[PDB]
Amino acid sequence: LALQAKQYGDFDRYVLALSWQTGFCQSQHDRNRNERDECRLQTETTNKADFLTVHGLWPGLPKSVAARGVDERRWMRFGCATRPIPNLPEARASRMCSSPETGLSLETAAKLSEVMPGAGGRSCLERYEYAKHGACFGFDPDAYFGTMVRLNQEIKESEAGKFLADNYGKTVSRRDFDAAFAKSWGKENVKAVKLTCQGNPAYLTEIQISIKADAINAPLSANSFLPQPHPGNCGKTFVIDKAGY
Numbered sequence: 001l002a003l004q005a006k007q008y009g010d011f012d013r014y015v016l017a018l019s020w021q022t023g024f025c026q027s028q029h030d031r032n033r034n035e036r037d038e039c040r041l042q043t044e045t046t047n048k049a050d051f052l053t054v055h056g057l058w059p060g061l062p063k064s065v066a067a068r069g070v071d072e073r074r075w076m077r078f079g080c081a082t083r084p085i086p087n088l089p090e091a092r093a094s095r096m097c098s099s100p101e102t103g104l105s106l107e108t109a110a111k112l113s114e115v116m117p118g119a120g121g122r123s124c125l126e127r128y129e130y131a132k133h134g135a136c137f138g139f140d141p142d143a144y145f146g147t148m149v150r151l152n153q154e155i156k157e158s159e160a161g162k163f164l165a166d167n168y169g170k171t172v173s174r175r176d177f178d179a180a181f182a183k184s185w186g187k188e189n190v191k192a193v194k195l196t197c198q199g200n201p202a203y204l205t206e207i208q209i210s211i212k213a214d215a216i217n218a219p220l221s222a223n224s225f226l227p228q229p230h231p232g233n234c235g236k237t238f239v240i241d242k243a244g245y
C-alpha cells in the first residue's frame with residue numbers, strides 16, 4: 001500500500017535512517033551502555049550487507065508545525081510529540097515498550113523483524129519509531145514499515161550495499177563509498193547521504209538518506225533524493241565495523 005499522511009503532509013523529505021548494525025552495537029558497548037538482545041551474540045551472517053538494518057523513516061518538519069514556533073531541533077527531539085503541535089504522546093527511548101503497539105499485520109511484523117533486529121518482543125523499537133515519527137501523520141503502519149523494509153532492500157542491493165559487504169571490516173574512504181552510491185543513484189545524489197561514525201579508529205554506525213517526500217512510494221531512482229549540506233561526522237576514511245566487540 002501507499003504511504004500517505006492524513007495530516008501534516010507538508011514536509012519536504014523523509015530521512016531513511018539505516019544502522020550499520022555491528023557499529024551500532026559496537027558504539028553501545030564502547031560507551032558502557034546496557035547490552036541489547038539484538039546485539040548480545042554478535043551473530044555473523046553470510047551476506048554482510050544484511051548488517052545494514054532499518055532504524056527509522058523520519059518525516060521532516062511539516063510547514064504547518066514550523067509555523068507554530070517549532071524549529072528543526074525541537075522537531076528532531078520530539079517528532080510527533082512536539083509542542084504546541086502535533087503534541088501526540090511522547091515516545092521514551094528508555095521505555096520503548098511503553099509506546100502503543102502499532103497494529104502492524106503479522107506478515108509485516110515478520111518482514112520488519114528481518115531488517116530491524118530491535119522490533120517487537122520486549123524491545124519494541126518499531127513502537128517507539130511509529131510513536132515519534134508516524135502516529136501524528138496517520139500513516140498506515142503496514143505501509144510505513146513496508147516502505148522502510150522496501151527502501152532498506154533497495155539500498156542493500158545497490159552498489160552502496162555491495163560496497164559495505166565487499167569492504168566488511170575494512171577501512172574505506174568517503175571517496176570510494178560515494179563512488180559506489182553514485183554508481184547506483186547518481187553523483188548528484190551523493191550528498192543526500194549523511195554518514196555517522198563513532199570511536200577511534202572511527203567506525204560506521206549510521207547511514208541517513210534524504211528522500212523527496214513526493215517520491216517515497218516509488219522505487220528509488222536518481223530523481224528520488226534530496227541532497228543536503230551535512231555529510232555527517234565520519235571524516236575522510238572510517239572502518240566498516242565487523243561483528244564482535
Ligand SMILES: [Ca+2]
Nearest residue numbers: 026242243244
Ligand atoms: Ca564491532
